[PDB]
Every structure is written in C-alpha cells, then in structure tokens.
C-alpha cells in the first residue's frame, strides 16, 4: 500500500514505546459497552485477550508490507468459526484509536490519526475474508 518512511516509524515506535496491552484492553472494554452486540461474539478476560490481539498487531508491523498473508488463517477463524461480521471489525480498531487519542491528547493530530486510520484499514482488509 506504500508506507511513507514516517508512517512506518510512527507505528513501530508506538508498539515499542507505548503500553499497547492496556490500550487494547481498554479498547475491548469500550467496544463492549458502546457496541453491545459485540459481547454476543464472546460467549475469557479482556486483559488476557488484549495480549493476544496486540500480539497479532505486532507481527503485523513486523510484516507491514505483507499483512494479508500473515493474517491468512487469522481471518478464517474470525469467519468460519466465530462468524464475526466483516463490517464489525472496524468497531475494535476504531476503539483502539479513541484510546490512543485519549492518551496522546494534543499530540494525536489529524495527520497522525490518518496514519493509524491507514494502518487499521489494511489490518481490517487482511483479517476480513
């Protein structure tokens, strides 16, 4: 998708310098309350599940230029197993972005938001069908 140098830096530097485990944890919590129907899919602890997810997103920055393949099976699970609706994936990442915005406040400019938006857009594409 073409990753501007600055873009790569921003993602990887965040997964290294920031506590993504608790960011994602809080994001799962937010999601479950804001978009109630998401609970249905999880019928387990958010704190524990967070590590798994951040773990997957981490391998994603490692293989940024090739997420679709690294997420091959990952999507299969979400589809023909848990049956998660493809149009619901953005609900989590959207919540991860809010948590990120609340932590960085002013530093989370429209421009930086766009970097993260771009990143989750490709993560959403990779993990959905």
């Amino acid at each position: 998708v073409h990753w501007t140098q600055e873009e790569r830096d921003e993602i990887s530097k965040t997964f290294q310098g920031t506590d993504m485990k608790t960011v994602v944890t809080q994001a799962l919590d937010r999601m479950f309350k804001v978009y109630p129907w998401t609970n249905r899919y999880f019928q387990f602890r958010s704190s524990i599940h967070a590590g798994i997810v951040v773990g997957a997103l981490q391998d994603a920055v490692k293989h940024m230029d090739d997420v679709k393949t690294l997420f091959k099976d990952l999507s299969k699970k979400h589809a023909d197993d848990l049956h998660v609706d493809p149009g619901s994936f953005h609900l989590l990442t959207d919540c991860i972005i809010v948590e990120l915005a609340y932590l960085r406040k002013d530093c989370f400019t429209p421009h930086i938001q766009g970097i993260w938006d771009k990143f989750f857009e490709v993560v959403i594409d990779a993990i959905s069908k």
Partner: peptide
C-alpha cells in the same frame, strides 16, 4: 432483537 438476542445490526 436488541437487548435480548444481541443481533449484530449488520444483519
């Protein structure tokens, strides 16, 4: 369909 069955609005 909402509070009870938790149907994903996408359906």
């Amino acid at each position: 369909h909402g509070k009870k069955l938790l149907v994903d609005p996408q359906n």
